[PDB]
Amino acid sequence: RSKSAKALSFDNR
Amino acid sequence: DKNELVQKAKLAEQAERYDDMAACMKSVTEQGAELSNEERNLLSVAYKNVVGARRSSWRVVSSIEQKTEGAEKKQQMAREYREKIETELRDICNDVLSLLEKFLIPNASQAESKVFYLKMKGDYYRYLAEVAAGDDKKGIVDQSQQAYQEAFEISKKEMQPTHPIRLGLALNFSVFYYEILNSPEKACSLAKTAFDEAIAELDTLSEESYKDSTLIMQLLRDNLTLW
Amino acid sequence: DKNELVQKAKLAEQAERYDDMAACMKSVTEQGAELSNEERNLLSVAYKNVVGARRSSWRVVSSIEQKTEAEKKQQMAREYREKIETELRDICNDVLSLLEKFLIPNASQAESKVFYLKMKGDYYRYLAEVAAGDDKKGIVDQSQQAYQEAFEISKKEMQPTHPIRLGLALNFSVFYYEILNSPEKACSLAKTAFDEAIAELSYKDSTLIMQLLRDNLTLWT
To answer: What are the Phosphoserine sites (modified residues) in this protein (chain A)?
Structure first.
C-alpha cells in the first residue's frame, strides 16, 4: 500500500 | 470435493488468479452434476477472465502486425507471437466448449440454463472465429451462429425481453453478426429489436434484475450508436 | 538472438504477458553480457509484474485468512496463501539469483551497482513481506544491507536528482515504514531525498519519483 518504484458484449457475471 | 473446490475457486477469484479459478470449476464440472447458479457463474467468470487475457494480448499483438505492414523482420515477430497466443486462445476455447458439450448443456435441466450455456457456446465459437483464418473459419462461424440461434429462439420462447440472460444473448448475437460475419444491418435490427421490446416494458424488471438488464440495455444502445 | 529477445520482450510487454517478457530478459541476462539501460529496465518491468501479481494475490488471501480466525475455511485460505508464497519466493529467488551470478558482477558503473543493489533490496523485501517466524530476521537484514550499501554509493557518487538515486530513496524509505515499521525514519529518508533534489532542481523518470516520494510523505504525515 505504500508507493514504490470497440463493440461491447454482455457483462459476463 | 465439490464443496472444497468451489471454495478454492471463490478464493482464487478474489486473488485474481483466474487460471487457478478455472481449474477448480473444470473439476467441479467434470464431476458430472449440474452446476448451481453460483457454480455456473464462477466457471463463467473464470474462463471469461482466462480467455479474455488472451483476446487482449491477441488484439494488441495483431494490431501491431497490421501496424508493421511494410516492416518485415518486425511483422514476422509480431505474427509468430500472435500465432503463439492464438493456440493458447483456442485450447482455452476448446476446453470450455468441451465442458459445454460433455457436461453443462447435457445436464441443463432448465430453460434458462439451456439458454445460458448455448449463449456461452456461441460466445466461445465467436472467440475462435475472431482468430480463425479463411479455411477453418467458415465452420467455426457457423458453429457459433448455430449455437446463438437455438439459444435465441429458446430465450424468445421462455423469457421476458427484460431478462438479463435474454438481453445478454441478444447483445452478444448482434455483436457476432456485426463483427463475425459482418452483417451490420442484421446486427442493428437484432440489437435494436431487443432494445425496443425490453425498453417498452421496463416495468417488468424485478428487484433482482434491474441493474443487469439496464446495464446490457445500455450496452445495446451503445453498440447501436457505434453502428 | 539478443535483440530478437529484447524485441519479443517489448512485444510480450505491450501484450501484458510478463511471464513471456520475463523469460526473454532472463535468457538475455543469462548470456553473460552487461545489460544496457533498456534491457535492465525491461528486466525490472518484467519481474516487477511477475512478482507483483503474487504480492497482490498474497495480500488478498492474507487478510482473508486473518479475517477468518471459522477453521476449515481458514485452513483452505492458509494453504492457498502458502502456494502463492511458494510461487512468490521462486520468483524473488530467480531474480536474486540473477542479481548474484550476472547482474551485480557485471556492474561496472556506479549507477549500475546501485540499480542492482536497490533491486536486490527490493526482492529481499518482497521475500520479507511473507517471511514469518525465525525466517523474517535475516531476510530483512539482507534487504536492508543491500539498500544501505546501495544508498551509500549513490550518496557519494550520484546527484540528488538522479532517477536511480531517487528511486532507491523511495524504496529504502518504503522498507523502513512497511518492513521495519519506522515511520519517523522512513519520513526522514524520503523528505531528505526530495529536499536535496529540489535544491539541485531525468525529469520524466525523476519527477514521478518525487511524485511518489511526496505522495508517500503526505499520507504518512
So the answer is: 4, 9
- As a whole number of angstroms, the distance between CA C81 and CA C60 comes to 9
Query: For residue B135, what is the domain's CATH number?
Result: 1.20.190.20
| A8 interface with B at CB cutoff 8 Å | yes
Residues of chain B in contact with residue A8, where contact means CB-CB under 8 angstroms, are 171, 175, 219, 222-223
- Cell numbers linked to B12: 482464487
- The three grid cell numbers given for residue C51, joined into one nine-digit string: 512478482
Cα separation of C110 and C41, whole Å?
A: 16
- Cα B212 off chain centre by: 16
Q: Please, which experimental method was used?
A: X-ray
Rounded Cα distance between B32 and C161, Å, is 63
- Whole-number Cα distances in Å, C221 to B214, C25, C95, C186, C188: 44, 39, 34, 11, 11
- Dist CA B43 CA B12 (whole Å): 12
Q: Are C165 and C114 in contact (CB under 8 A)?
A: yes
CB contacts, 8 Å: A7 with chain B = 175, 178-179, 223, 226-227
| Interface size, chain A vs chain B, as Cβ–Cβ contacts under 8 Å | 36
User: Is residue C95 within 8 angstroms of chain A, CB to CB?
Assistant: no
The three-state (H, E, C) secondary structure of B80-122, written as one string: HHHHHHHHHHHHHHHHHHHHHHHHHHHHCCCHHHHHHHHHHHH
Those residues whose C-beta lies under 8 Å from the C-beta of residue C117, and which sit 6 or more positions away, are C104, C146, C147, C149, C150, C153, C168
Resolution (in Å) of the shown entry? 2.2
Q: Which of C11, C64, C76 sits opposite B77 (nearest CB)?
A: C11
Domain count, chain B: 1
* Chain A residue numbers touching C178 (CB-CB < 8 A): 1-2
* Best residue in B2, B11, B13 for a mutation probing chain C (most C CBs within 10 Å): B11
8 Å CB contact of B169 and A8? no
- What grid cell was written down for B211? 441493474
**Helices and strands (DSSP H and E) totals, chain C:** 10, 0
CA angle at residue C107 from C106 to C109, to 5 degrees? 135
Would you tell me how many other CB atoms lie within 10 Å of the CB of residue C33?
11
- Domain containing C15 equals 1-221
Shortest alpha-carbon distance between residue A5 and chain B (Å):
23
Closest residue by Cα to residue B113 from B161, B151, B170, B149:
B151
